[PDB]
Amino acid sequence: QNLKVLLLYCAFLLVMLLAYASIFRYLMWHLEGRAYSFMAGIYWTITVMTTLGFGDITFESDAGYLFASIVTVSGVIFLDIILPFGFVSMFLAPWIERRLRYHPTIELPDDTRGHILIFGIDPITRTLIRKLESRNHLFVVVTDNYDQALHLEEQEGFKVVYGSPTDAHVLAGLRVAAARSIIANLSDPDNANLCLTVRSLCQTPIIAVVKEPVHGELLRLAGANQVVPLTRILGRYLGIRATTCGALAHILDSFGNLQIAELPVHGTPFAGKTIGESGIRQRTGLSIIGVWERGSLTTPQRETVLTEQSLLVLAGTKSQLAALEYLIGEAPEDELIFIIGHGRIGCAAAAFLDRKPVPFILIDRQESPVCNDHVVVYGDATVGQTLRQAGIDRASGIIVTTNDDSTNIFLTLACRHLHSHIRIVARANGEENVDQLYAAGADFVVSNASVGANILGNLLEHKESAFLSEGMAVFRRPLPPAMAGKTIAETRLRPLTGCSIVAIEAPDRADILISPPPETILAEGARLILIGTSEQEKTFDQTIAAR
Amino acid sequence: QNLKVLLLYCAFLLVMLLAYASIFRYLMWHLEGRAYSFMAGIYWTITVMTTLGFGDITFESDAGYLFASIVTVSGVIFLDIILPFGFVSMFLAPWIERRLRYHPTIELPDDTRGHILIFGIDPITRTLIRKLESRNHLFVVVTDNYDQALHLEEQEGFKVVYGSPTDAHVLAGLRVAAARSIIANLSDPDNANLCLTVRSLCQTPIIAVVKEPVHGELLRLAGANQVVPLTRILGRYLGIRATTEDELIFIIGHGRIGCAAAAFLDRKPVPFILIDRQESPVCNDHVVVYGDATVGQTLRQAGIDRASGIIVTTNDDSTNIFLTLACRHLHSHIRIVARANGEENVDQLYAAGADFVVSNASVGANILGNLLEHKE
Amino acid sequence: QNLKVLLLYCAFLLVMLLAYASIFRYLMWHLEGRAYSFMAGIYWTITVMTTLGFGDITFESDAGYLFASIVTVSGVIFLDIILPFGFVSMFLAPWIERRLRYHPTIELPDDTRGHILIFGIDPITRTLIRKLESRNHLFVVVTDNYDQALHLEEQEGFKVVYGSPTDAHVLAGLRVAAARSIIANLSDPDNANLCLTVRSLCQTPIIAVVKEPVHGELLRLAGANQVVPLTRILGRYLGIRATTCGALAHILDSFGNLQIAELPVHGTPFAGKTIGESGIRQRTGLSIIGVWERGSLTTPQRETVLTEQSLLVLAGTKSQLAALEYLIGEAPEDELIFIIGHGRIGCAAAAFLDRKPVPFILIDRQESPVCNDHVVVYGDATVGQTLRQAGIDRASGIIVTTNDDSTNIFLTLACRHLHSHIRIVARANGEENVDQLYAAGADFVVSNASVGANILGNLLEHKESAFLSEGMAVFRRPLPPAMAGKTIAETRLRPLTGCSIVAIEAPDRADILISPPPETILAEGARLILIGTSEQEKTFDQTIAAR
Amino acid sequence: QNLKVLLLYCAFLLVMLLAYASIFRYLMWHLEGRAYSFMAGIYWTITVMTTLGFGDITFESDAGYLFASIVTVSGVIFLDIILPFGFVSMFLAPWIERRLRYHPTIELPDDTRGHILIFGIDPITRTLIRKLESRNHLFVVVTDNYDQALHLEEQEGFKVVYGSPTDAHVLAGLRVAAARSIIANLSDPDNANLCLTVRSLCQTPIIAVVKEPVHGELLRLAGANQVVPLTRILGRYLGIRATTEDELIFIIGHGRIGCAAAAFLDRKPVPFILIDRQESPVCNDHVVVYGDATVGQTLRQAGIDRASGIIVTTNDDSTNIFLTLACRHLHSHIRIVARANGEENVDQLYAAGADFVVSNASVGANILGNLLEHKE
Ligand SMILES: Nc1ncnc2c1ncn2[C@@H]1O[C@H](COP(=O)(O)OP(=O)(O)O)[C@@H](O)[C@H]1O
Ligand SMILES: Nc1ncnc2c1ncn2[C@@H]1O[C@H](COP(=O)(O)OP(=O)(O)O)[C@@H](O)[C@H]1O
Ligand SMILES: Nc1ncnc2c1ncn2[C@@H]1O[C@H](COP(=O)(O)OP(=O)(O)O)[C@@H](O)[C@H]1O
Ligand SMILES: Nc1ncnc2c1ncn2[C@@H]1O[C@H](COP(=O)(O)OP(=O)(O)O)[C@@H](O)[C@H]1O
Ligand SMILES: OC[C@H]1O[C@H](O)[C@H](O)[C@@H](O)[C@@H]1O
Ligand SMILES: OC[C@H]1O[C@H](O)[C@H](O)[C@@H](O)[C@@H]1O
Ligand SMILES: [Ca+2]
Ligand SMILES: [Ca+2]
Ligand SMILES: [Ca+2]
Ligand SMILES: [Ca+2]
Ligand SMILES: [K+]
Ligand SMILES: [K+]
Ligand SMILES: [K+]
Ligand SMILES: [K+]
Ligand SMILES: [K+]
Ligand SMILES: [Zn+2]
Ligand SMILES: [Zn+2]
Ligand SMILES: [Zn+2]
Ligand SMILES: [Zn+2]
């Protein structure tokens, strides 16, 4: 806006120069009978407006004096007054204001399209923003907290809009209809308010982070396209790690046709072994769709070594998972898990361990305001003897799940020093503490920030097939001998059936190809894993038989 | 003010020009025997004070040199020093004390007349201002809270004054005597203070919004012209909608309004159940079940199944929406009457499953509006 | 500092002008054989430094060119660079800093003498400062609260120093030794800390406002020259006003020789009557040393009318006060005083009423943290029925003493409307509410702010005879017939005895002259009231008999 | 940095001058057949770019006019626009971001070496810095509290960094690897976090101040080189002074230090009485009389009459002074040992009536000082 005003002024200046130069020649002629060239006219007019004033060309008439004077004042006005004033008002004042006084962004420009609206800032969403700023996605966080909007604009890896997240006028200004996605990370009541409100304007996909798993149905009702029970998921993860030996954890039941389950490898026979050596696919009929270790979901190779901290992601039928549990097989007796911290996550961990069930003890300094189902040992786990008196000694595992990382580090530090034998699973509230938790002696660390972001991020990047894969089922099919040699693009499975190929695995290998390219040549006896509607899964073996 | 001093300066300049032009001609004549025209004196003086310096017209005498030096230094003092120092001191300084450091208005212009003072800004009064904008009144809201004065400075269809509502010196700079009307929407003790204070200065009509209907008489006594028991009115509105045996009405929220609702259902009578997360500080005529309506089995363990009606009356609209959603989810047909604290939430309450929605802001503003128009 | 730097620059500029002018003439001569005058030299040098450049006087030599150039650059540097920069750095930058950013005054300049140090800001001291700013006394308030020091510098009717009030380094910077007086209005422990600390530096008189009357001796021990029990005094004042009829309140016992007592006139026979009509001096032998009414301690005239709100200040012997109490004389039965608010002042009021004693009831919403001696009826006096249930009906008086003026107004409003008969005494925390308390129906209002300031102010203005009148006694003497006609300055009572004349009263009048001028002619039979040491009160009748 | 750009500009100017002076001579010659000296070219160019404009040397040709116009516009662009815009943009802007809006230091210069990091500023560490100033170390204190960073910016004999003490990215910009020593004076859990974090970057020696002596072992385990149990030391100091039957010692204040004092008197043994206004959150081996030592009969109703010694150990120095005064007032000769939290109060405690005064700041600093010098 300002460079235009700047150089539009330069246009006016230039036109003024020509005009005065032209009139200068006109007057020198008609008033004094002197002829000057165009260059002389420019030269004189510059000399005067610029106040150099050589004096080698002057008028002698009064009318020439009046004109010289007019041109002279014009220079003083348009080079010594307007120009610096224009500068101090179009450049300096705006900058000094924005740099001395926070001016809240109330509204998003009309043209904004395909942006990600973030409602409710916290470690999870802060980590999300940093993780997808590495992709340079357009993130707008929205807050109704003035002191917060300030703080977020100074280290702005993101634009901030200050406004009530539940006003439709605000949402309109945020251009929610034009938005790509929306993360709803407010309280459950505010989220409910937000979804209903956004839904009154648009059909933009909303991802809600629910604080109490029972409110999930309620938030879908309000209009959330996806609901993520973080504290439950986080508790579940502190849970599967706390047992002395690893154990299956069912993730998705895709109609009873295909199950997805995860298995931590600690304490299991598979620990220390390589994948093909453990022979899981051969003995279970399961598919290993990935090895999550060190924060990276990698694809399974035969020579890939499973460590105590590894976690297998598995897919197969209900009976194939039962075979795996037999191979493990039987849990050790007198398992006793101390869960320090009885907030939402601590509660979630205990609730997961009760699903099995595994004997646990909850400790917290205060009584839960939300839970009435769990008996808790009240005490400060930091003040001496409190853990001892709770029977920390006959414990086989400690989950340390406090809202404070330093306390978690300190507890992990102490427990591992007094009980070098037992399993220690620690909660990291920020990723800046994960390493020290390990250094303190924790066997595994669950990092809320990254886990939360990994989920939300994947729901975001796989959005184009998220609400597609929502209501749809993932299934597995033995590659029919008819296509033993043909390529994916040649078979044309999608325009006939409507399903997609998300995995191919070899008949006698633990090696699987994830999301195969259309030029992939299909081998004989191979096993396909597909995803599609519950009307395309039945119209598969039908349509594939017809053509 | 800035224009006058600036153009008063231009006048002094213009005088100084004519002065120097004339002295120039006078000296040129008497000192050097040269005759120059009036236009030549202007042109020369402009030429020298502007530092152009053509040099085509110069004195040759010492006295002419001395004069020329004086006019040169004048141009510098008055165009290159004072004029720019003028700019900065005169109107770059107002820009700092009004744009870099927030300066709240502590007084209205002496001649302010016909304005409606607002004491106690809230959804109701904010809705009132944004409702009567087509009549174009000058609404002035008054707060003694700096941060609130600051936030109300940008969100505007109204002016903000900052000072103690109960200070007579503050009300005078507010020009109460010349105001059209006062809306007193502070606490009952504060309103009483305000009325008595205003009544010591003037007879400006006051509309007081009262929290406890028993205090209505006291507020009229302090000097309020009208008294509006909004919470009683709002509660009566909810109770009316909850009905028009085995009839049982669940009233979630036992604040002042939910209380008014139950006070209403007492007269019918229709049996009800009050739930609140707190013991009431002002009431002890009603039996309340304590608990957070949001947490869990709280509503079930209060017996919300054999209820025939539900009134949602929390001071928080998102809570209201959430409860409405949850109740409509559990029981597809049970009559739900819901409270909207701000009119921004009215539609989501309906979308949540409510059968009728009482809109506090809209109801308050209408009463207050119809009181501002009909009384004045 | 800056105007000196400003015009010292103008000196350098001027010297530069002369120098260049002189050299200009020197060079025109020796380099070109041209002679110019001094005026021509000034004229040329100004023309060039100022960049006018007429061109009617130029050099032709190269050395003349070099010189013209040097002078030219000098003007650009010293009129176009230095001068505006010097301005933007000595004028603009300091102002913009002080006006955009609060710079705390850490220290008082060395030369500061005779200033009043204020430690502990509140309504009392805020009122004090405004009351003695009308005298233009030098007030420095000291605070260790940053956010407060800011707030006080914007509406500065006073300089603010930001610092720990108990650091001797701070006190040294405050120049406590050079100070006139010091008001110690911190907590009792901080005050104790302050006195001891100040006393380690100087002997500057300290006035301490004690929060708990029992700590008074403790604070004198620490070094306070004067101790003021505000809450006790304030309670006492709500107390003497709450009874249905006025009653003597003893103030000072000057060794048993002379007592000072105050008497509110409400309910007494003296109400409605004029002073000489009530004939108090004649019937009691007392002196009426003043009539406090409407915030003004006036002198008593015979025709002065006593109203229900008046308060007599009285002086005389123990027996003369007993005579007055008989004249009153006997209090009405079934007195019942409701005291709403049981903080320090409320407690003080009850404690005063117990000195008599008068039956009272204390009401408060919380239990006192400091008092264990008073039985209190717990309740919110605002929520309905609470007062009724307390038996507010058989009350003869209500003291309303809450920390909140609006609540006091509202209570006063309600009580007077439900009980138009009973005595209502209200507490005003700020003077901006005193009038409305009266308008609400209060019979008398005690204004903490003004009362506090009136006391502190008088201890300050009478400082030159405060620590003098501290340890000294005030006494009254019948004017001996020997001086029946002589003038004060002629008697020479001070250089003989050492006492002072602070009052003269006529033999058959209620008219008294306060602080008589030395030219006063003494009448026959008159009664003198004097003040002096307990060694000059005995060496009075001795020295006055000898000469 | 500002000097270089500024004087690099002067160089460009000087080049431009010589350039224009030479072109001037060249054009004057080839275009007009006039020969001018080098000095004449400087003088002319200075005359034109500076807008003086003597006019004694002017071209007569169009090409000479065009050139003169170019040099004139150059003077304006480079002396009346860029140079002043240079001033403001180059060093009037740093003045706003460093003097009108506080900018905390979030990182130390890359080459910072030999500095002592302070984590947890308090009277002890503040006394430590102001004590070792004669050795002239570069003390850097680190806070994660903005307002505290701000206040510590003015009160200085030390530098202030602002960031999370337990962030590895923050400790790296703090150049821990090249630091002389670290004083860890946060809470026990925070100290543990800090040690482990520092130990992942470097082997810089750490002196941790520990609150609960049982946690000493844990802190060494986390990586602290020395562990200092100050509160135990301070309490032992008080208990030593309270003594060197019917001996009974009143210990006012049952925080960590007063506890340490009583833990000390247990070993002798000398019977004592603890008074505190609160139940201890960390202790339950000692019996405590609850009450505020200041309020009233509290000390008498605890039996402070038959006490033979009194230890004042409150976290507040004015409270300590006040109690000492009151105790010395009641009993003229009873041994009183008093705690000074900051050394500013040591003398008033003595003036209050104390027999011995333990100065936390002075004792802490000496230990920490003698640990900084002797270990390094
Ligand atoms: N030292 C401690 N000992 C026992 N419990 C603690 C301690 N410190 C914190 N806690 C508890 O840990 C819980 C924190 O969990 P919270 O953040 O509130 O929910 P969530 O479990 O989902 O993270 C709190 O309830 C808190 O009381
Ligand atoms: N989740 C909740 N469950 C039960 N009561 C609630 C809940 N949230 C708010 N409330 C109650 O709503 C009341 C607010 O009262 P108020 O705004 O004065 O009028 P109303 O009668 O409409 O509730 C409070 O007493 C508060 O305790
Ligand atoms: N509505 C009320 N009903 C009863 N007591 C009240 C009410 N409001 C305030 N109070 C009490 O009045 C007392 C205020 O006195 P406070 O300022 O604390 O000491 P002081 O008596 O010296 O002024 C408080 O203890 C407070 O509890
Ligand atoms: N007026 C008081 N009466 C009794 N105890 C007090 C009083 N003021 C402070 N305290 C106590 O002093 C204690 C402070 O403990 P701390 O600073 O950790 O070390 P210390 O052992 O020296 O007291 C607190 O427990 C606090 O309750
Ligand atoms: O510059 C003025 C000019 O005006 C006309 O065009 C004349 O023809 C020309 O001779 C003259 O030079
Ligand atoms: O201005 C220069 C002057 O120098 C000497 O003083 C000469 O005597 C004088 O003739 C000349 O005018
Ligand atoms: Ca860390
Ligand atoms: Ca809404
Ligand atoms: Ca008032
Ligand atoms: Ca001190
Ligand atoms: K010329
Ligand atoms: K010229
Ligand atoms: K010029
Ligand atoms: K010029
Ligand atoms: K010129
Ligand atoms: Zn639970
Ligand atoms: Zn009720
Ligand atoms: Zn009491
Ligand atoms: Zn202990």
Author numbering:
A (entry chain B), C (entry chain B): 18 to 564
B (entry chain A), D (entry chain A): 18 to 261, 350 to 481
Recite the paper's sentences.
Each GsuK subunit contains two tandem RCK domains, reminiscent of Slo K+ channels. We demonstrate that GsuK is a nucleotide-activated and Ca2+-deactivated K+ channel and reveal the structural mechanism of multi-ligand gating of this double-RCK K+ channel and a distinct pore opening mechanics. Ca2+ stabilizes the closed gating ring by binding at the inter-subunit assembly interfaces and deactivates the GsuK channel. While both NAD+ and ADP anchor their adenine rings at the same site on RCK2 by using the conserved nucleotide binding motif, they utilize different functional groups and activate the channel at different sites.
To reveal the structural basis of nucleotide activation, we also co-crystallized the L97D mutant with ADP and NAD+ and determined the complex structures at 2.8 and 3.2 Å, respectively. The overall structure of the nucleotide-bound L97D mutant is similar to that of the apo state, with the gating ring in a Ca2+-bound, closed conformation. In the ADP-bound structure, the AMP moiety of the ligand can be unambiguously defined in all four subunits within the asymmetric unit at the same position as was observed in the isolated gating ring structure. The electron density for the β-phosphate group, although not as well resolved as the rest due to higher mobility, points to two possible configurations. In one subunit, the ADP is in an extended trans configuration, whereas in the other subunits the ADP is in a cis configuration with respect to the phosphoester bond. In the cis configuration, the β-phosphate makes a sharp turn and inserts itself into a pocket formed by the loops from βA-to-αA and from βD-to-αD on the second RCK domain. The pocket is located at the base of the flexible interface and analogous to the Ca2+ binding site in the MthK RCK, suggesting that ADP binding in the cis configuration represents an activating state and promotes the gating ring conformational change at the flexible interface similar to Ca2+ binding in MthK. Albeit with opposite gating effect, the Ca2+ binding site of GsuK is analogous to the position of the Ca2+-bowl in BK; and the ADP activation site in GsuK is equivalent to the Ca2+ binding site in MthK.
